[PDB]
Amino acid sequence: QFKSWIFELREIVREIKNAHYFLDSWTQFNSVGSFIHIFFHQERFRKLL
Amino acid sequence: VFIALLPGILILWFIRESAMLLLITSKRFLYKKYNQLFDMAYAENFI
Amino acid sequence: KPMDVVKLTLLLSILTVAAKKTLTLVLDPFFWMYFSWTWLFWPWFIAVGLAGYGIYCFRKHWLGEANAFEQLGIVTSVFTWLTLVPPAYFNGYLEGWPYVFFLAYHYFFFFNVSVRKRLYGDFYARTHDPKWDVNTPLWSRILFGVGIMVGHWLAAFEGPELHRLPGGWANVGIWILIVITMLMHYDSTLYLARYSEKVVVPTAVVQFGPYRWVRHPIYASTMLLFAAYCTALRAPLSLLFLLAVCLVYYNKKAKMEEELMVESFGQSYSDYADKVRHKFIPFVY
């Protein structure tokens, strides 16, 4: 029955690689991560200009 | 002073996020467990 | 067997004398003091050992079993000894331009690699027509390379001492020129690669973007970042010699490639060249 706890934990992990809704700190984390990802890629850098 | 004050804030932030994750995972697990316990008894018949 | 015992005793004795030497070296005061004496010269040791690692990886890549890490390592060693070392030896210290242009070269080498991971499965060489790839005699290639280094080192040396070059509103020109050369090179590479099926096998004639200003924009963009490094250090003569050598080699290679696509495409590239004559510089060359 301990496998159900791990099931819920990694299902929540799957949900937080999404944007359903959660606490604000993780949303700010994902926003700055997405900004870093956009900025680092050059083919994503040019289309910003 | 900024890099001096940073690690305490960061470690307390990791503590907070870990506690939040544990609490939310336990909440989901207890919710499904209590609903499953109720559903053996009151829902369609069961196995 | 007794021979195993004899060889084990011999190995134990050799290890004992080697560890004795190691232990009397570790606890040696004069050895550590001279170690600290030679600690004074640390940045030049990595700069020279990277040359040995690079030539080893370059011989391996010439043989052909180099992983991508070794190829990027060769790229990094070239960029360090062409944009980090020239003002690390001829000034003794780096501040300002060298780090920026060293990363700018790494940034500028990474479009033929980035595009050819995006619009491909991987970097694996597709089977293609052997006469499509432009090949030039090796002496001409090494002459071009030597001329390019002579221009860059000459910009480093003839250029003034490092921290005396001004700032404020006079350092916006290199910014806009670098932006222009990156933009124009990216446009040229994208317009060249969006039509070709294989690595270099064009189907139609490209006459869009910088191709409607100049016949060879990739080479002129490499030329312009050359001029950008040389102008960041404010040395006109080395810029002129760089221009001369790159004009000679790029014009030779442009002549062979131009006659190849004239032969291969017929009237199409002929009318394209009639539309835009200027080969390297807009209405200058």
UniProtKB/Swiss-Prot annotation, chain A:
It is found in: Plastid, Chloroplast stroma. Belongs to the Ycf2 family. Probable ATPase of unknown function. Its presence in a non-photosynthetic plant (Epifagus virginiana) and experiments in tobacco indicate that it has an essential function which is probably not related to photosynthesis. This is Protein Ycf2. It comes from Arabidopsis thaliana. The chain holds residues 5 to 53 of 2294 of the full protein.
UniProtKB/Swiss-Prot annotation, chain B:
Induction: By high light. It comes from the Eukaryota. The chain crosses the membrane at residues 1-15. It is found in: Plastid, Chloroplast thylakoid membrane. Probable ATP-dependent zinc metallopeptidase. In the N-terminal section; belongs to the AAA ATPase family. This is ATP-dependent zinc metalloprotease FTSH 12, chloroplastic. It comes from Arabidopsis thaliana. The gene is FTSH12. The chain holds residues 433 to 479 of 1008 of the full protein.
